[PDB]
Design a protein around this ligand. Structure first.
Ligand SMILES: Nc1nc2c(ncn2[C@@H]2O[C@H](COP(=O)(O)OP(=O)(O)OP(=O)(O)O)[C@@H](O)[C@H]2O)c(=O)[nH]1
Ligand SMILES: Nc1ncnc2c1ncn2[C@@H]1O[C@H](COP(=O)(O)OP(=O)(O)CP(=O)(O)O)[C@@H](O)[C@H]1O
Ligand SMILES: Nc1nc2c(ncn2[C@@H]2O[C@H](COP(=O)(O)OP(=O)(O)O)[C@@H](O)[C@H]2O)c(=O)[nH]1
Ligand SMILES: [Ca+2]
Ligand SMILES: [Ca+2]
Ligand SMILES: [Ca+2]
Ligand SMILES: [Mg+2]
Ligand SMILES: [Mg+2]
Ligand SMILES: [Mg+2]
Lengths: 438, 350, 426, 54
C-alpha cells in the first residue's frame, strides 16, 4: 500500500475537497466521527482505503488531506461542518486576507510568507506515509489563491518530493458563475508555471457542470453546492482505483502511463454518465451500451468541445455497478461503427476498462438519483485544445490594452511574465495542432 | 433584436443575406470581432468553431458545418467515397478517381496505373483529367506519362479522374455543359434542394480529337467568358435554366428533367450528405450549424448523372440571388431566430 | 473580520454620512442606541465590517466625524441616530473653512489633521484585519474638499497598502453655494486621481433633476438630495455588508472595476425611483431597464456618449435569480456598442436576499464609463472661465498658494479627460 | 477486438481491448524569484513615500 495526499487550495479547492471527503466517507462506510465499523484492524492496516485515510489508536480514520486558503471564511465551514471531527487543526491552514483574484498576490506577495508553513504541514502527513505515491491538488484557475499560490506550491513540491507524482483537479473559469474579470490572466499565468510540475491534470469547466445541473438535474440556477456534489462524483470515479481493490490505475504513476504519452499534453477529457435527477419520479435504468454511448456525447463532458474533430491518444473506461466485460466489449464494437473515433497513428486504437461492482454512492438529500450502473471515460483528445483557444483569446483581448496589468505589477510581478506565460500557451496550442490536424 | 457579424466580405451570397437581415429591422450588425452575436457569417478558412456556443444566454448559429471540408475538397472527396461503406469504391455515380501526391513529397500512383494499363490493353477509351483544389490548372490527356509528369511539376495534392468521353451535347451547338445544384442544410439537418439549377454551357462545339484546347472541354464560367469566341450566343452568359433545359429534353429526347436527371441528382445529394451526417451534425452540440453547398454534375449521352465535386463556398446565378438568399433567411436563420409559399426548396427526406 | 473605517468631513460629508449610517443601521437592525433588535441572522453575519462591538452587546459605528466648524456636527449629535456615534470620534475646529480649499488643505485643516489621524489610528489598531477606508465629502467646499483630500494623503502615507474609497459629491452651478466651487473641485480631483482606488462620483445636478423631473418634488432641498445618496450608498455597499460572492471586499471590487489606475471614477445608479403609484410591484425587467436608464444615474453623464469599461449590478430582494441573469444578458446583448469589447464579461451581477426598507426589491448600478469625462469637462470649463481672469484667486493666494498650483491642477484634469478619450475609441 | 490483461477480484475486474495496432528550478532559484518580486514592491512603495514626502 502506498499513500496519497490531497491538497485543496483556495475556495474552489476547499469546497470541492469538502464534498469529495463527504462522498469518500459514505463510499467506505466511515461515519462523521471517523469510526469505520467494517475496519477490523483497529489503528492500523494497509488496505486500499488506507491510501486516503490514516488511522489513530482510537480507530479514527483521518483523511490524508491539507486545506489551504488565504482567507478563513471558507475553511471555517470545514472546522464547523458535519465532518469537522474528521480533521485535526494541523490540516486546516487559513490566512487573514486573500489574493483578491490577483495571481501575483497569491504567488508572490502572500505566497512567499505562507509557503513554508504549508510545506511544514504537508511534511507532517508525509512522515505518516511508508511509501508516499504523490499528491492530488484541487484548485481553481480564476482565483488568486487557486492560481497564484498553487503554482508556487507545485514548484516547491517538485523540489521537496522530486520522485513523487502530482495530479491536478482544476476548475476552468466560466462567466456564468465567475466573480472576476481577470480570470483569463490568472488561468494562463498558473498553467505556464505549473505545466512542467503536473504529471496529469483533469480540467472541469464550470460552464459544463453548470449546464448539466440545469439540463439533467432540472436546477434553474445551480449553486456551488450543486456543482460540487456533481464534481465529487466524477472525482470519486477517477480516484476509486486508488481506494479500492483492482488492477487498473492502482497508483498515480499508472495515470501518466495510461493517459499521457506526451508530457506537456497531460489534460485528459472527462465524460460521465448517467446524471439522473433525484426528483424524477419514474426513471428507466440505462444499459451498458447506453451509458457507454453517452461518453461520446458533448453534453456529458466536463469540458464542452467536439472530440469528432480531434485525435485520441488514450482512452479509459471506468465503470461502477452492474457491469460485465462481455457487455462492455459489445457496446464498444457498436460505437466504433457509428462514432468518429480517430486515434493518432503512433498509438494503439484500444480502450483500458475498469469495472468496480459497487454502484455510485449518492449523498442523502443530494440531487443525484441512485443508478444501477455508471461510467466515467477519460480520453486524452486534442479536442480539449478548444478550451485553451477560448481562454488565450480572452487573454489576448485584455492584454493588448494592458488592462488590469498594473494590479499584477504592483504586487512585484514583472510585466514580461505575461508574455512569457502567453508564449508558452501558444506553444501548447501548437503541440495539440501538430498531434491532431493533418 | 437579433445580432450577427460578417467575417467574409468576399461572399456575394451572404452579402445579400446581410442586406436582407438588416431590411427586416430586427437584425443588428456588430463588429466582426464582437463575441455577443446570435449569427456568424464566418470566414472560409480557419473558422474558429471552438469559440462558438460559450456566451451565456446567446443561442449562436454559424453558416458553416465543421467537418464539411471532407466533402468539398478534391482529394478529400475521393478518399471519402473509397473509404465510406455507404458510398463504397463501387459507387456508380462518381467517376473513377485516384489521389496522387507529387513525387517531391497515402498515394495511389500504382493503383491508378493498374486501372490505366487495364484500359489501354482493352482498347477502351483511356482519357483522364488531372486537377487539384489549389487551381484557378487542369490537364486533360490520354497518356499516363503526361498526367503524372504534370502533377510532379506542382507541389500540391492532385486527383486523376476518368474523363467523361461521352457527355450529353446540347443542340444546336454540339456543346458540353455541367449542372450546378444549390443545397441548403439547416440546423436540424434537413436537406433542401433549391428548385432552380443552372447549366453552365460551353459556347464551343465539343471536339474529342483535341484536348490541348480546353475551351470546349471546361464549362467554367470564367473560362468561357475569357477564352471562348461564342460566349453568349445560344444563351445569355452560357447559363441555361431548368425551364429552357426541361423544354429541350422534351423536344429532343421525349423526356423530362425530373425523370432523366433530377432523380439521380437528388439521390446523389442525399447519399453524400447522409454519409457525413454523424461527423458534422450539430444536433446535440453547444452551437448550431447550417451551410449552403454547390454540387456539380455531369451528364453523359446515356442520361446518366455523375458527380464532379462539391463546393462549400459557392456563388449563385445573378438571376437567382434574390430568391435563394431570401430562402436562406426563411429556412436557415428565421427557423432558429423567428421574427415578429409554396417553398422554393425541395426537401430530400431521410 | 475585514473591517472598514469610515470618515466623513465637512458639511455635505457629515450630513450624507449621518443619513448613510441611519439607513444601514435600520437594515442591520441597530437602533439609535446601538442595540440590536433585528430578526434575521444575515443582519449580524458581516456586521463587524462597519460596526465595533462594545460591552453589553452594543454596536458602535466605526465612523469618524471631521469638520472645521461645530455647526453641522452639533446637528448630527442631536439628530435621529446622533447618540450612536463614539463621542471621542467627533473631531472639529471652530474657525471654519470659508468654502476655501487652501484653508482646508494647507492652513486651518493642517492644524487639525493630526488629531483626526489619532482617532483613525485608534480605530485601525482595533481591527482584526483592516480592509481600507471610505470617505464621504463634497469637492465644492473647503473642509470636505481641501481637508478631506489632505486626510486621504496622510492616510495613504501611513497605510500605503490599504484601499482608499470615497463618495465624492461633485458641485454644479444649478445647485451651488459659492462661485469658487469649480476651483475647489479641480484641486480635489487631482488628489483623488492619485490617492483613491475607487471614487463614486455623485453630481448634485443629477440629484436635483431626479428629485424634480422623476420624483416630482417641486422644490428640492439638500435633504431630498441626501436621501438619494443614502439609498445609493446602501446599494453599493450591500456586497460588503451581507454574504455574497462578487465584490466581496474592497480590494476584489477594485480589481474587477479598475483596468487602469487613474480611471477609477464610477457612476452610481439606483432603481426604483418612484414618485408618490408607489405601491405597484416592480418586475425584474422594469428594475433592469430603469437601472440602466440615464435618468436613474447620479453623475449627470449620458452613458450613450461613452462606453462602459466595467459594470457591477446588485439586485436586492426575493426575486428570480434566473430571471435576473436573463434581463442582464438582454441589456448587454441589446446594447453591445456601449460596452468595450476588449474586456470580456465586464458586466458582473450579484444578488442579495434582504431588500432595502420599504421596497420588495431594488437594484444598484455601478459603472466605470468613459462618459464620466463629460463631468470633468464641465468642471474644467467652469474653472477656466474664471481662472483666465484670475477671478476670486485672492481667497487662495491669501492662504499661501500661488497661481502655478492652479495651472497644474488645470492641466492634470485635462490630462485625465484626454485619458478617458483614448479608451472611448479603442 | 482482443481482450488482454484480464484481472478479476472480489470488488471488480479490469482488462484492455485493442481494436487496431498503431502505425526544474532549485530551491535557490525559487527564493530569488520571490525575493526579487519583494524588492520591486519595496522600491515602488519607497517611491510612493518619497512622492508623499515631497
Ligand atoms: N465548481 C466550483 N467552482 C468554484 C467554487 N468556488 C469558486 N469557484 C470558481 O473559482 C473561481 C474563483 O476563484 P476562487 O477559488 O473562489 O478564489 P481563491 O482560490 O479562493 O483565491 P482568492 O482570490 O484569494 O479568493 C471562479 O471561477 C468560481 O466560479 C466551487 O465551490 N465550486
Ligand atoms: N471527370 C470529368 N470528365 C469530364 N469533364 C470534367 C471532369 N471533371 C471536371 N470536368 C470539367 O471541368 C470543369 C471544372 O472542373 P472542376 O469542378 O474540378 O474545377 P473547379 O472546381 O475549379 C470549377 P467549380 O467552381 O464548379 O468548383 C467542369 O465544368 C467539367 O466540365
Ligand atoms: N448633496 C448634498 N450636497 C451638499 C450638501 N451640503 C452642501 N452640499 C454641496 O457641497 C458643496 C459645498 O461644500 P460644503 O460641504 O458645504 O463645504 P465644507 O463644509 O467646507 O466641506 C456645494 O457644492 C454644495 O452644493 C448636502 O447636504 N447634500
Ligand atoms: Ca484498519
Ligand atoms: Ca517534477
Ligand atoms: Ca488657527
Ligand atoms: Mg478566496
Ligand atoms: Mg471548386
Ligand atoms: Mg456649506
Amino acid at each position: 500500500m502506498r499513500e496519497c495526499i490531497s491538497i485543496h487550495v483556495g475556495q474552489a479547492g476547499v469546497q470541492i475537497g469538502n464534498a469529495c471527503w463527504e462522498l469518500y466517507c459514505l463510499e467506505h462506510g466511515i461515519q462523521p466521527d471517523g469510526q469505520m465499523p467494517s475496519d477490523k484492524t483497529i489503528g492500523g492496516g494497509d488496505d486500499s482505503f488506507n491510501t486516503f485515510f490514516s488511522e489513530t489508536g482510537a480507530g479514527k480514520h483521518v483523511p490524508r488531506a491539507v486545506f489551504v486558503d488565504l482567507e478563513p471564511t471558507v475553511i471555517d465551514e470545514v472546522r464547523t461542518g458535519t465532518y469537522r471531527q474528521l480533521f485535526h487543526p494541523e490540516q486546516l491552514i487559513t490566512g487573514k486576507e486573500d489574493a483578491a483574484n490577483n495571481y501575483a498576490r497569491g504567488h508572490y506577495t502572500i505566497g512567499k510568507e505562507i509557503i513554508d508553513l504549508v510545506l511544514d504541514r504537508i511534511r507532517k502527513l508525509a512522515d505518516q506515509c511508508t511509501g508516499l505515491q504523490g499528491f492530488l491538488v484541487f484548485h481553481s484557475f480564476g482565483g488568486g489563491t487557486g492560481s497564484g499560490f498553487t503554482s508556487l506550491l507545485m514548484e516547491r513540491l517538485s523540489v521537496d518530493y522530486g520522485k513523487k507524482s502530482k495530479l491536478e483537479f482544476s476548475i476552468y473559469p466560466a462567466p456564468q458563475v465567475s466573480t472576476a474579470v481577470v480570470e483569463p490572466y490568472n488561468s494562463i499565468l498558473t498553467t505556464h508555471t505549473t505545466l512542467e510540475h503536473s504529471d496529469c491534470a483533469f480540467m472541469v469547466d464550470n460552464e459544463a457542470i453548470y449546464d448539466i445541473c440545469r439540463r439533467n438535474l432540472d436546477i434553474e440556477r445551480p449553486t456551488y453546492t450543486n456543482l460540487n456534489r456533481l464534481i465529487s462524483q466524477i472525482v470519486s470515479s477517477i480516484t476509486a482505483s486508488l481506494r479500492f481493490d483492482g488492477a487498473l490505475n492502482v497508483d498515480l504513476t499508472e495515470f501518466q502511463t495510461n493517459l499521457v504519452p506526451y508530457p506537456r499534453i497531460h489534460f485528459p477529457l472527462a465524460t460521465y454518465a448517467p446524471v439522473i435527477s433525484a426528483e424524477k419520479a419514474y426513471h428507466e435504468q440505462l444499459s451498458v451500451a447506453e451509458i457507454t454511448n453517452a461518453c461520446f456525447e458533448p453534453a456529458n463532458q466536463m469540458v464542452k468541445c467536439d472530440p469528432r474533430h480531434g485525435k485520441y491518444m488514450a482512452c479509459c473506461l471506468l465503470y461502477r455497478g452492474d457491469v460485465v466485460p462481455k457487455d462492455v466489449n459489445a457496446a464498444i464494437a457498436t460505437i466504433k461503427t457509428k462514432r468518429s473515433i480517430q486515434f493518432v497513428d503512433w498509438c494503439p486504437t484500444g480502450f483500458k476498462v475498469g469495472i468496480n461492482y459497487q454502484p455510485p454512492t449518492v449523498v442523502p438529500g443530494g440531487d443525484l438519483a441512485k443508478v444501477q450502473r455508471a461510467v466515467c471515460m477519460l480520453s486524452n483528445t486534442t479536442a480539449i485544445a478548444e478550451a485553451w483557444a477560448r481562454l488565450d483569446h480572452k487573454f489576448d483581448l485584455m492584454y493588448a490594452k494592458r488592462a488590469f496589468v498594473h494590479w499584477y505589477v504592483g504586487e512585484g510581478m514583472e510585466e514580461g511574465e505575461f508574455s512569457e506565460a502567453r508564449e508558452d500557451m501558444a506553444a501548447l496550442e501548437k503541440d495539440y495542432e501538430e498531434v491532431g490536424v493533418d | 433584436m437579433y445580432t450577427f457579424v460578417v467575417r467574409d466580405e468576399n461572399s456575394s451570397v451572404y452579402a445579400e443575406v446581410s442586406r436582407l437581415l438588416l431590411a427586416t429591422g430586427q437584425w443588428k450588425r456588430l463588429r466582426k470581432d464582437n463575441p455577443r452575436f446570435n449569427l456568424m457569417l464566418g470566414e472560409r478558412n480557419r473558422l474558429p468553431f471552438g469559440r462558438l456556443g460559450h456566451e451565456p444566454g446567446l443561442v449562436q448559429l454559424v453558416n458553416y458545418y465543421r467537418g464539411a471540408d471532407k466533402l468539398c475538397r478534391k482529394a478529400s472527396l475521393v478518399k471519402l467515397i473509397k473509404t465510406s461503406p455507404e458510398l463504397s469504391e463501387s459507387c456508380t455515380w462518381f467517376p473513377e478517381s485516384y489521389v496522387i501526391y507529387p513525387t517531391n513529397l497515402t498515394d495511389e500512383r500504382e493503383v491508378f496505373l493498374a486501372a490505366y494499363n487495364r484500359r489501354r490493353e482493352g482498347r477502351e477509351g483511356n482519357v483522364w483529367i488531372a486537377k487539384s483544389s489549389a487551381g484557378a490548372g487542369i490537364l486533360i490527356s490520354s497518356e499516363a506519362s503526361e498526367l503524372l509528369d504534370f502533377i510532379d511539376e506542382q507541389g500540391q495534392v492532385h486527383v486523376i479522374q476518368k474523363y467523361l468521353e461521352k457527355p450529353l451535347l446540347l443542340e444546336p451547338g454540339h456543346r458540353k455543359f455541367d449542372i450546378r445544384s444549390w443545397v441548403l442544410v439547416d440546423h436540424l439537418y434537413n436537406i433542401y434542394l433549391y428548385r432552380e439549377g443552372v447549366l453552365r454551357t460551353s459556347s464551343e462545339p465539343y471536339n474529342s480529337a483535341n484536348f490541348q484546347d480546353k475551351t470546349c472541354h471546361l464549362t467554367n464560367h470564367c473560362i468561357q467568358k475569357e477564352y471562348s469566341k461564342n460566349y453568349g450566343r445560344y444563351e445569355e452568359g452560357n447559363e441555361m435554366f431548368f425551364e429552357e433545359f426541361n423544354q429541350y429534353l422534351m423536344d429532343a429526347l421525349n423526356t423530362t428533367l425530373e425523370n432523366s436527371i433530377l432523380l439521380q441528382i437528388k439521390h446523389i445529394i442525399r447519399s453524400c450528405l447522409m454519409c457525413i451526417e454523424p461527423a458534422i451534425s450539430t444536433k446535440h452540440l453547444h452551437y448550431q450549424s447550417f451551410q449552403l453547398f454547390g454540387f456539380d454534375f455531369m451528364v453523359d449521352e446515356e442520361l446518366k448523372v455523375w458527380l464532379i465535386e462539391v463546393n462549400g463556398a459557392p456563388a449563385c446565378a445573378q438571376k437567382l440571388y434574390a430568391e435563394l438568399c431570401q430562402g436562406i433567411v426563411d429556412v436557415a436563420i428565421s427557423s432558429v431566430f423567428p421574427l415578429a409559399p409554396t417553398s422554393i426548396f425541395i426537401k430530400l427526406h431521410h | 473580520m475585514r473591517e472598514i473605517v469610515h470618515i466623513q468631513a465637512g458639511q455635505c460629508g457629515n450630513q450624507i454620512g449621518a443619513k448613510f449610517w441611519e439607513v444601514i443601521s435600520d437594515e442591520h437592525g441597530i437602533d439609535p442606541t446601538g442595540s440590536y433588535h433585528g430578526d434575521s441572522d444575515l443582519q449580524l453575519e458581516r456586521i463587524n465590517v462597519y460596526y465595533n462591538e462594545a460591552t453589553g452587546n452594543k454596536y458602535v459605528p466605526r465612523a469618524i466625524l471631521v469638520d472645521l466648524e461645530p455647526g453641522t456636527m452639533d446637528s448630527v449629535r442631536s439628530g435621529p441616530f446622533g447618540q450612536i456615534f463614539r463621542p471621542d470620534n467627533f473631531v472639529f475646529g471652530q474657525s471654519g473653512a470659508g468654502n476655501n480649499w487652501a484653508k482646508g488643505h494647507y492652513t486651518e485643516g493642517a492644524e487639525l489633521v493630526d488629531s483626526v489621524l489619532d482617532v483613525v489610528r485608534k480605530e485601525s489598531e482595533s481591527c482584526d484585519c483592516l480592509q481600507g477606508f471610505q470617505l464621504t465629502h463634497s469637492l465644492g467646499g473647503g473642509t470636505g474638499s481641501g481637508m478631506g483630500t489632505l486626510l486621504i494623503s496622510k492616510i495613504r502615507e501611513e497605510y500605503p497598502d490599504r484601499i482608499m474609497n470615497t463618495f465624492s459629491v461633485m458641485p454644479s452651478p444649478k445647485v451651488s453655494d459659492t462661485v469658487v466651487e469649480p476651483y475647489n473641485a479641480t484641486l480635489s480631483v487631482h488628489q483623488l486621481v492619485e490617492n483613491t482606488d475607487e471614487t463614486y462620483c455623485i453630481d448634485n445636478e443629477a440629484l436635483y433633476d431626479i428629485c424634480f423631473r422623476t420624483l416630482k418634488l417641486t422644490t428640492p432641498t439638500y435633504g431630498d438630495l441626501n436621501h438619494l445618496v443614502s439609498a445609493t450608498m446602501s446599494g453599493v455597499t450591500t456586497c460588503l455588508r451581507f454574504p455574497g460572492q462578487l465584490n466581496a471586499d474592497l480590494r476584489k471590487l477594485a480589481v474587477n472595476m479598475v483596468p487602469f489606475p487613474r480611471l477609477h471614477f464610477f457612476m452610481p445608479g439606483f432603481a426604483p425611483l418612484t414618485s408618490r403609484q408607489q405601491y405597484r410591484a416592480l418586475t425584474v425587467p422594469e428594475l433592469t431597464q430603469q437601472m440602466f436608464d440615464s435618468k436613474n444615474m447620479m453623475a449627470a453623464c449620458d452613458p450613450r456618449h461613452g462606453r462602459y469599461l466595467t459594470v457591477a449590478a446588485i439586485f436586492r430582494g426575493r426575486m428570480s435569480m434566473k430571471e435576473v441573469d436573463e434581463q442582464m444578458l438582454n441589456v448587454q446583448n441589446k446594447n453591445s456598442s456601449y460596452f468595450v469589447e476588449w474586456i470580456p464579461n465586464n458586466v458582473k451581477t450579484a444578488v442579495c436576499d434582504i431588500p432595502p426598507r420599504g421596497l420588495k426589491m431594488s437594484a444598484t448600478f455601478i459603472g466605470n464609463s468613459t462618459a464620466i469625462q463629460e463631468l470633468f469637462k464641465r468642471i474644467s470649463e467652469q474653472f477656466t472661465a474664471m481662472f483666465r481672469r484670475k477671478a476670486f484667486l485672492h481667497w487662495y493666494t491669501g492662504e499661501g498658494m500661488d497661481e502655478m498650483e492652479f495651472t497644474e491642477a488645470e492641466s492634470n484634469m485635462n490630462d485625465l479627460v484626454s485619458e478617458y478619450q483614448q479608451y472611448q475609441d479603442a | 477486438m482482443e481482450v488482454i490483461e484480464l484481472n478479476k477480484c472480489t470488488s471488480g475486474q479490469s482488462f484492455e481491448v485493442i481494436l487496431k495496432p498503431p502505425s526544474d528550478p532549485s530551491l535557490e532559484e525559487i527564493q530569488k524569484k520571490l525575493e526579487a518580486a519583494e524588492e520591486r514592491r519595496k522600491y515602488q512603495e519607497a517611491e510612493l513615500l518619497k512622492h508623499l514626502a515631497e
